[PDB]
């Protein structure tokens, strides 16, 4: 067989400022969210209707309307408000800011690719440190190496005075620079192949010669591994420092808006100046927006409460991955307290009228309309709300053959959710079969269950042919039966099959019972109070010897001179003869063993006859 | 119908394929004759009965049965839990 090939993929990659612009194209320039009076989206703000899309689909910021492209006065599109959930914006940062994930997280990717200690980069980005010789692909004329913490006295007055201002600034950012701009310049002019070769040769030199002699090696292996991945992909190492800041769509942030304001609050302040301190404030605003809590003390709000960043909202047990994506709340679902029903079949459950009418509402509407008892959908829904007596006939009709899924709360294995055929029961409780309680680990002291309705034909087929209880009698753990009688049923069976009192518990003195043609006679005598449940009796047996008993020789053989002999065992009597081939069997038993055997036999025979 | 479902799976190498084929046949049934299903006749039950009948074993159509003892219109059986 040729496999039905399906080649589907998804990939993440570090994004480019050009791709950010293509997302937004659309720049958010003002930190205003809404008008204080009219509660309208402020233009160029975090909720700008021109940037992100029309609130109240098909209307402009002015108030015009068109049938569901751009307006002239306010320039708002004519589309659905769906776009406000997907359209991105961007913030044009005056200075580049590094991405916190790629600088502060350990081990730092920027530090390893640039090959400098992390404290040096942190001082360069946060403190007032200037880096010497940031780029190499352009010539220089100075002998400043490393990152001098102190400002160079000559570079402050002498060289700027000799080299004036315009040309000096023209060649300024080629020998000395500071902040994330220097880091981005270093990343942009990196030669990755040279990095790989230098790392390999240094690794060989170290090897040809014992803790940090190894840790330096692991850095070299890590760096050339990191350098290789940039060559074969389309990612650029300078994208780890951000030039633009994408903005979340407004409808996803109806806390986050506060952090977006601060970026605009401090970036628009910085562009007014154009100073070192304000550049750092913009960088910290982006870090708090992107990832709080990595920089030691996390920035708090006025209430001394830690802000929540995108990393916080995507990670953790309550994050997007583990709470919104791996589990969902669903429609066509109900819940109620479960009570025991011993008269139910193993494949049936009982549903309250309210839960059933809610879950099967659309099917009841179809049933109403189909037989001309409802003119339209609205009339049918009004009839359903009025609890008309004909709503329940249609509900009972449409529930036939449509399975439902029950589920108890702590689903520890797959038998924690099973499929049953719903029937309408009075009250407000879910009627549950007693033999399926062990699979659900359910008892009737306050437990509740959820109900789900498969809608499509494929789901109904799956529920009927895979999840019903009569095809799930074995547990997948070891293969043992899961629907075994327990407690009350087990006690009843034990009492039924506990035979006669024997020995000194039957007779007061040392002994120095009715005979029934068939089991029906014995059971009839029991019904007429002629015998007890455990009183001994002899039953004529006309089948093969199939009674479980100890493998023992007869207690006593009564051999007659005419040829017939009687063999007396502990639990049966066998009459044989030498003249004939006759062989009679009488079983010493009670009405209880007969009843158990007849129950199982009649179950088998009735199931066979019904098919 | 439980016995019939077990019988149909005795000739199926894969049960998931059986479920998919039954669902596809039921979908064809509903698409061809939409109005005949959803009430007393269910498409999946009709498919199961037809597959049982195709073996030569007589079954009521779609296992559709009613109560002959309903005391006229409007009366709904009250189940005894």
């Amino acid at each position: 067989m040729i496999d039905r090939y399906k080649h589907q993929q998804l990939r993440i990659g570090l994004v480019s400022p050009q791709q950010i612009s293509a997302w937004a194209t659309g720049e958010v320039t003002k930190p205003y969210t809404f008008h204080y009076k009219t509660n309208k989206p402020e233009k160029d703000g975090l909720f700008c209707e021109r940037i992100f899309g029309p609130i109240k689909s098909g209307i402009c910021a002015c108030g015009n309307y068109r049938v569901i492209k751009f307006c002239e006065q306010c320039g708002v599109e004519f589309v659905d408000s769906r776009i406000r959930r997907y359209q991105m914006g961007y913030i044009k940062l005056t200075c580049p800011v590094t991405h916190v994930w790629y600088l502060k997280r350990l081990p730092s990717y920027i530090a390893n690719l640039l090959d400098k200690p992390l404290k040096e980069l942190e001082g360069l980005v946060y403190c007032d440190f200037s880096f010497a010789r940031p780029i190499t692909k352009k010539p220089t004329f100075l002998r400043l190496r490393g990152s001098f913490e102190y400002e160079i006295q000559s570079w402050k007055y002498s060289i700027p005075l000799f080299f004036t201002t315009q040309g000096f600034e023209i060649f300024r950012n080629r020998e000395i620079s500071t902040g994330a701009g220097a880091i981005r310049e270093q990343l942009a002019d990196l030669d990755l192949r040279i990095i790989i070769e230098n790392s390999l040769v240094e690794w060989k030199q170290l090897g040809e010669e014992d803790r940090k002699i190894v840790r330096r090696k692991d850095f070299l292996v890590r760096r050339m591994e990191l350098a290789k991945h940039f060559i074969r992909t389309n990612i650029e190492p300078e994208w780890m420092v951000l030039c633009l800041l994408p903005v979340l769509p407004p409808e996803l942030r109806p806390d986050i808006n506060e952090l977006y304001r601060r970026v605009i609050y401090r970036n628009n302040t910085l562009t007014d100046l154009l100073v070192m301190c304000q550049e750092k404030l913009v960088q910290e605003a982006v870090d708090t927006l992107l990832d709080n809590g990595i920089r030691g003390q996390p920035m708090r709000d006025g209430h001394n409460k830690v802000y929540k960043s995108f990393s916080d909202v995507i990670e953790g047990k309550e994050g997007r991955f583990r709470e919104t994506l791996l589990g969902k709340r669903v429609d066509y679902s109900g819940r109620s307290v479960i009570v025991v029903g011993p008269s139910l079949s193993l494949h049936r459950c009982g549903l309250p009228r309210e839960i059933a009418i809610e879950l099967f509402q659309t099917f009841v509407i179809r049933g109403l309309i189909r037989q001309h008892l409802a003119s339209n959908i609205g009339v049918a829904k009004s009839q359903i709300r009025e609890k008309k007596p004909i709503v329940w006939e249609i509900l009972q009709e449409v529930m036939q053959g449509h399975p439902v899924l029950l589920n108890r709360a702590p689903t520890l294995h797959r038998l924690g959710i099973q499929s049953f055929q719903p029937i309408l029961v009075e009250g407000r409780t879910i009627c549950l079969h007693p033999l399926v309680c062990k699979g659900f680990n359910a008892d009737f002291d306050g437990d509740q269950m959820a109900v789900h309705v498969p809608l499509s034909l494929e789901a109904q087929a799956e529920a009927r042919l895979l999840m019903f209880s009569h095809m799930n009698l074995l547990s997948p753990a070891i293969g043992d039966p899961i629907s075994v009688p327990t407690q009350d049923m087990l006690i009843g069976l034990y009492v039924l099959t506990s035979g006669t009192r024997r020995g000194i518990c039957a007779n007061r003195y040392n002994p120095c019972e009715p005979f029934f043609c068939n089991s029906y006679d014995a059971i009839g005598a029991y019904r007429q109070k002629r015998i007890n449940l455990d009183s001994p009796l002899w039953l004529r047996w006309q089948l093969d010897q199939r009674v479980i008993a100890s493998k023992e020789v007869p207690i006593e053989v009564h051999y007659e001179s005419f040829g017939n002999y009687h063999e007396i065992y502990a639990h049966y009597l066998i009459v044989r003869s030498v003249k004939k081939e006759t062989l009679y069997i009488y079983i010493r038993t009670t009405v209880g063993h007969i009843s158990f055997y007849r129950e199982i036999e009649e179950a088998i025979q009735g199931f066979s006859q019904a098919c | 119908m439980t016995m019939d479902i077990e019988r149909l799976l005795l000739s199926e190498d894969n049960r998931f394929e059986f479920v998919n084929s039954v669902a596809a046949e039921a979908t064809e049934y509903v698409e061809k004759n939409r109005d005949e299903y959803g009430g007393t006749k269910k498409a999946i039950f009709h498919v199961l009965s037809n597959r049982v009948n195709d073996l030569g074993f007589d079954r009521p159509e779609a296992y559709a049965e009613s109560d002959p003892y309903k005391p006229g219109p409007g009366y709904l059986k009250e189940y005894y839990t």
């Binding site: 799956e462 895979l466 | 479920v19």
Partner: peptide, 17 residues
Amino acid sequence: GTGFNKGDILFYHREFC
């Protein structure tokens, strides 16, 4: 599970008679 393995001549030409 169920998702595994991706789930006119002879007309207008009769005998004139």
